[PDB]
Structures are given as structure tokens and as C-alpha cells.
């Protein structure tokens, strides 16, 4: 289970979206190293221009690559569910604006870790910070709170993202998440703990298409 994460793991991400009716597709690839807690990915909007700011999709775009220290390794649900994988589902409320709903299947297919995502956004304001692309191209660190959900054989997660806005203000994105195993086998249901997450966003100077380079560093504690 955790044996699959002993070294570098290539990743594929596939997302199909519809936000306020604007359909779009994103494809991503890169690699993850759970030993370091390191994720390194590049995403391309394949249908043209992304109708939403890239930072709003960071959380949607593989927590099995979190580094769990040795004394916390029996609390790593994400790896224990591999390779058959897990369903990750979210609702994300952007304060005073729209909401996203996402369903993602994260599982090994061969040696590649794949994240396949369907995203539906509604209630966004035409002249608001998200459909107006008034979000800065950065991210902040956040703690993610992980609880067991023995009844569905998985975990529930709640956390709030602070997106920096181009005017100095901050826009909150309230995340509700649950993960349930795809496989019929047994998983690790953890005690309460959190993942400390850092994310850095950049651009490929040689990439002419609309895109985002994402680096994440993730570590468990508590």
C-alpha cells in the first residue's frame, strides 16, 4: 500500500469542467515523491482559456503524496487505499460568490497515479472576483483537518482557503471533502490529524498555451 510510494511516482491529471455554463478541459502531468512530501505538476487548459483563475483549482488538482512521519504512518488513509484508489468528493463555497462541486477518482493504473476529475461550478457572479479574474497568482499555506468516517469507511475533511485578491483583500473558499475507498479491501482509518500544505504557482516561459505549474509540499502532523 505505502510500498507503492517508496520512490518517485509519475502522475496524470484529467479534468472536465463546467462553470456557469463555460465547458472546459484540463490535462496535467508530473511526478510525486511521498518521501519528501513533494508534488510537481503542470496543467494545460486544452480547450483554450480557463474560464476561472487557476488558483481556485489548486485544491482540486493527490494527497497520497503527503509525507507521513514514522509515528503517524498508521494514519495514512490515502496510501492505504492504493492501488485500487479512492473517490474524492468536494463542495467548495467561495464567499459571496459561486461554488464548485467535484468528484475525482485517484488510483494507480499501472505505475502511473491518475486523478480523473469532473467539476461543476454554479452561482458565480459575472462581475465578481472569480469570473473577473481578480485573484492574485499565488497561494498561501494551509492546514487541512482530517477525520475518520468509519461509517463510510473513509475520511471527512474541512478547511478554508484564503485566496489573495488583487486589491489586498482576501476571499475565503470553504472546502467540504470526503474520501471513500474504491477497493473492497481494508484501509487505515486515522485519528484526527492535519496535513500542513504549501503551494507555489509559476509559469513555463516556453508554454504558449494557458497553463499552470504547481509545486506542493505536504506533511502530516498532530
Amino acid at each position, epitope marked *: 500500500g505505502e510500498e507503492l510510494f517508496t520512490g518517485v511516482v509519475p502522475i496524470l491529471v484529467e479534468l472536465d469542467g463546467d462553470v456557469n455554463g463555460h465547458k472546459f478541459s484540463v490535462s496535467g502531468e508530473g511526478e510525486g515523491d511521498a518521501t519528501y512530501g513533494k508534488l510537481t505538476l503542470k496543467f494545460i487548459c486544452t480547450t483554450g482559456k480557463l474560464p476561472v483563475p487557476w488558483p481556485t483549482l489548486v485544491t482540486t488538482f493527490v494527497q497520497c503524496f503527503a509525507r507521513y512521519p514514522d509515528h503517524m504512518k498508521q494514519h495514512d488513509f490515502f496510501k492505504s487505499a492504493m492501488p485500487e484508489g479512492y473517490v474524492q*468528493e468536494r*463542495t467548495i463555497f*467561495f*464567499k459571496d460568490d459561486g461554488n464548485y462541486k467535484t468528484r475525482a477518482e485517484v488510483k494507480f493504473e499501472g505505475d502511473t497515479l491518475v486523478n480523473r476529475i469532473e467539476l461543476k461550478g454554479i452561482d458565480f*457572479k459575472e462581475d465578481g472576483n472569480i469570473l473577473g479574474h481578480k485573484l492574485e497568482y499565488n497561494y498561501n499555506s494551509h492546514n487541512v483537518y482530517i477525520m475518520a468516517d468509519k461509517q463510510k469507511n473513509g475520511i471527512k475533511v*474541512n478547511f478554508k482557503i484564503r485566496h489573495n485578491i488583487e486589491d489586498g483583500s482576501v476571499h475565503l473558499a*470553504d472546502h467540504y471533502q470526503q474520501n471513500t475507498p474504491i477497493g473492497d479491501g481494508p484501509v487505515l482509518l486515522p485519528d484526527n490529524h492535519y496535513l500542513s500544505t504549501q503551494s507555489a504557482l509559476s509559469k513555463d516561459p516556453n508554454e504558449k498555451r494557458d497553463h499552470m505549474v504547481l509545486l506542493e509540499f505536504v506533511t502530516a502532523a498532530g
Partner: nanobody
Amino acid sequence: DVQLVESGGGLVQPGGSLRLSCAASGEIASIIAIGWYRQAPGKQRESVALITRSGMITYGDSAQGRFTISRDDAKNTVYLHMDDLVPEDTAVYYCNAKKVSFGDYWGQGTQVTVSG
């Protein structure tokens, strides 16, 4: 399954105030947000006010600081306080409850009419 019961619609004069309430029953633990949408004549449904399990509050454009939403987590009821009402607030107000997965829960709808 969860069930939503609405009450408190009706006739009101301009400048006056109204309250809507909505009680939810059944699988309460799955609800992450509850609140209200409205649909005015000839217009598409627009979100008005929600409050999430964490207590965060989110208003659509029709609020304009005139609508307030509160939640009685004990009696699993949500309330919409609407005041300084105008004729253009005339519409059908729908209670709405959200879960993490696709697909919402909706109430039957309640008419609100503002006129002299």
C-alpha cells in the same frame, strides 16, 4: 434523503419586512450548507443566502445588506430575515440544502409578493 419544510411567505408592503423559515429532517449530518434561492418573474433562479456547517455566510447579489440569514442548529431550522423590501423582490423563495456530493435538496417554494 433529507426533507425541507418551508413556511413564512406571503403579502408584504414596500418598506416592510418578512421572515422565511425552513426546517430540515432526516440525514442532517450530511448537510454542509443550507439557505435560499429566489426566482423572480421571467428571471433565472439566483442564490440569495447560504450558511455553511462552519458558519460561513455567503450572499448572492439580491441581498444588498437587506437580507440576513441565521441558523438554529438545535431545531435544525434556518431563517431568512428580509426587510426594506421593494416590489422587485417579488418572487418564489426556495429553501435549499447542500451535501458534499452532486445533487441538492430543494423545498417546494414559497411565494413572496411585495405591493401596496
